[PDB]
Design a protein around this motif. Structure first.
Motif, PDB file in Angstrom:
ATOM      1  N   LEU A  47       0.826  -1.203   0.000  1.00  0.00           N
ATOM      2  CA  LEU A  47       0.000   0.000   0.000  1.00  0.00           C
ATOM      3  C   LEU A  47       0.862   1.256   0.000  1.00  0.00           C
ATOM      4  N   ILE A  48       1.964   1.241   0.753  1.00  0.00           N
ATOM      5  CA  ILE A  48       2.867   2.388   0.768  1.00  0.00           C
ATOM      6  C   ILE A  48       3.461   2.614  -0.616  1.00  0.00           C
ATOM      7  N   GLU A  49       3.870   1.534  -1.286  1.00  0.00           N
ATOM      8  CA  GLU A  49       4.418   1.666  -2.632  1.00  0.00           C
ATOM      9  C   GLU A  49       3.376   2.211  -3.600  1.00  0.00           C
ATOM     10  N   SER A  50       2.134   1.733  -3.494  1.00  0.00           N
ATOM     11  CA  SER A  50       1.075   2.237  -4.363  1.00  0.00           C
ATOM     12  C   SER A  50       0.823   3.720  -4.118  1.00  0.00           C
ATOM     13  CB  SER A  50      -0.207   1.433  -4.147  1.00  0.00           C
ATOM     14  N   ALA A  51       0.803   4.134  -2.849  1.00  0.00           N
ATOM     15  CA  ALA A  51       0.612   5.546  -2.536  1.00  0.00           C
ATOM     16  C   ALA A  51       1.758   6.388  -3.080  1.00  0.00           C
ATOM     17  CB  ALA A  51       0.477   5.734  -1.025  1.00  0.00           C
TER      18      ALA A  51
ATOM     19  N   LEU B 174       2.908  10.051  -9.791  1.00  0.00           N
ATOM     20  CA  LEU B 174       2.110  10.331 -10.980  1.00  0.00           C
ATOM     21  C   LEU B 174       1.445  11.698 -10.885  1.00  0.00           C
ATOM     22  N   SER B 175       0.915  12.039  -9.708  1.00  0.00           N
ATOM     23  CA  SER B 175       0.298  13.350  -9.530  1.00  0.00           C
ATOM     24  C   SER B 175       1.320  14.465  -9.704  1.00  0.00           C
ATOM     25  CB  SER B 175      -0.360  13.436  -8.153  1.00  0.00           C
ATOM     26  N   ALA B 176       2.524  14.281  -9.158  1.00  0.00           N
ATOM     27  CA  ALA B 176       3.570  15.285  -9.317  1.00  0.00           C
ATOM     28  C   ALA B 176       3.960  15.443 -10.780  1.00  0.00           C
ATOM     29  CB  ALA B 176       4.789  14.909  -8.474  1.00  0.00           C
TER      30      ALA B 176
ATOM     31  N   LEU C 296      10.632  10.353 -14.857  1.00  0.00           N
ATOM     32  CA  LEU C 296      11.322   9.070 -14.955  1.00  0.00           C
ATOM     33  C   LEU C 296      11.049   8.206 -13.728  1.00  0.00           C
ATOM     34  N   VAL C 297      11.157   8.794 -12.536  1.00  0.00           N
ATOM     35  CA  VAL C 297      10.919   8.030 -11.310  1.00  0.00           C
ATOM     36  C   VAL C 297       9.465   7.572 -11.248  1.00  0.00           C
ATOM     37  CG1 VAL C 297      11.010   8.097  -8.795  1.00  0.00           C
ATOM     38  CG2 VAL C 297      12.769   9.269 -10.142  1.00  0.00           C
ATOM     39  N   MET C 298       8.538   8.483 -11.560  1.00  0.00           N
ATOM     40  CA  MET C 298       7.134   8.105 -11.626  1.00  0.00           C
ATOM     41  C   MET C 298       6.910   7.018 -12.664  1.00  0.00           C
ATOM     42  N   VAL C 299       7.679   7.036 -13.753  1.00  0.00           N
ATOM     43  CA  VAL C 299       7.562   6.001 -14.772  1.00  0.00           C
ATOM     44  C   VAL C 299       7.979   4.657 -14.202  1.00  0.00           C
ATOM     45  N   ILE C 300       9.085   4.623 -13.457  1.00  0.00           N
ATOM     46  CA  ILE C 300       9.517   3.366 -12.846  1.00  0.00           C
ATOM     47  C   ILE C 300       8.419   2.819 -11.938  1.00  0.00           C
ATOM     48  CG2 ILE C 300      11.334   2.226 -11.531  1.00  0.00           C
ATOM     49  CD1 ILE C 300      12.310   3.439 -14.155  1.00  0.00           C
ATOM     50  N   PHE C 301       7.910   3.667 -11.040  1.00  0.00           N
ATOM     51  CA  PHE C 301       6.952   3.185 -10.046  1.00  0.00           C
ATOM     52  C   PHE C 301       5.626   2.792 -10.694  1.00  0.00           C
ATOM     53  CE2 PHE C 301       9.688   5.633  -7.033  1.00  0.00           C
ATOM     54  CZ  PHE C 301      10.009   4.569  -6.215  1.00  0.00           C
TER      55      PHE C 301
ATOM     56  N   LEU D 212       3.749  18.585 -15.777  1.00  0.00           N
ATOM     57  CA  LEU D 212       3.345  18.720 -17.172  1.00  0.00           C
ATOM     58  C   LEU D 212       2.387  19.890 -17.354  1.00  0.00           C
ATOM     59  N   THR D 213       1.450  20.064 -16.420  1.00  0.00           N
ATOM     60  CA  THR D 213       0.469  21.138 -16.534  1.00  0.00           C
ATOM     61  C   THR D 213       1.056  22.500 -16.186  1.00  0.00           C
ATOM     62  N   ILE D 214       1.998  22.554 -15.247  1.00  0.00           N
ATOM     63  CA  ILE D 214       2.586  23.805 -14.780  1.00  0.00           C
ATOM     64  C   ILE D 214       4.030  23.858 -15.259  1.00  0.00           C
ATOM     65  N   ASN D 215       4.374  24.923 -15.979  1.00  0.00           N
ATOM     66  CA  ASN D 215       5.714  25.099 -16.524  1.00  0.00           C
ATOM     67  C   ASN D 215       6.683  25.727 -15.531  1.00  0.00           C
ATOM     68  N   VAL D 216       6.218  26.089 -14.333  1.00  0.00           N
ATOM     69  CA  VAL D 216       7.107  26.698 -13.347  1.00  0.00           C
ATOM     70  C   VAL D 216       8.211  25.726 -12.954  1.00  0.00           C
ATOM     71  N   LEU D 217       7.854  24.462 -12.715  1.00  0.00           N
ATOM     72  CA  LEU D 217       8.855  23.473 -12.329  1.00  0.00           C
ATOM     73  C   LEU D 217       9.863  23.231 -13.445  1.00  0.00           C
TER      74      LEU D 217
END
Length: 82
Positions: free
Chosen positions: A4-8, A14-16, A42-47, A21-26
């Motif tokens: 469950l921790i890994e899923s969270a 994914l949310s980040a 990339l990290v979100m892609v791995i998870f 993607l939506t905000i160009n500030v980052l």
């Protein structure tokens, strides 16, 4: 618990990535010669890829269960190699 921790964590990644993607500030910040959003994605892609692999294995098992074919050898091979 641990799963469950890994899923969270994957959901948060994914949310980040979606926010980046939506905000160009980052995107204005970069590290290691690449944009920070690139590394975050990339990290979100791995998870999310681990999560998607688990989900796809479950879906394939379910489809095989609903599939007309019911060969005993095929079922054993699938169970072993999942």
């Amino acid at each position: 618990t641990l799963a469950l921790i890994e899923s969270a964590f994957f959901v948060v990644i994914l949310s980040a990535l979606v926010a980046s993607l939506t905000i160009n500030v980052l995107k204005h910040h970069t590290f290691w010669g690449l944009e920070v959003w690139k590394w975050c994605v990339l990290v979100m892609v791995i998870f999310s890829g681990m999560l998607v692999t688990n989900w796809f294995m479950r879906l394939i098992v379910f489809l095989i269960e609903t599939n007309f074919l019911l060969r005993r050898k095929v079922l054993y091979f699938v169970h072993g190699l999942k």
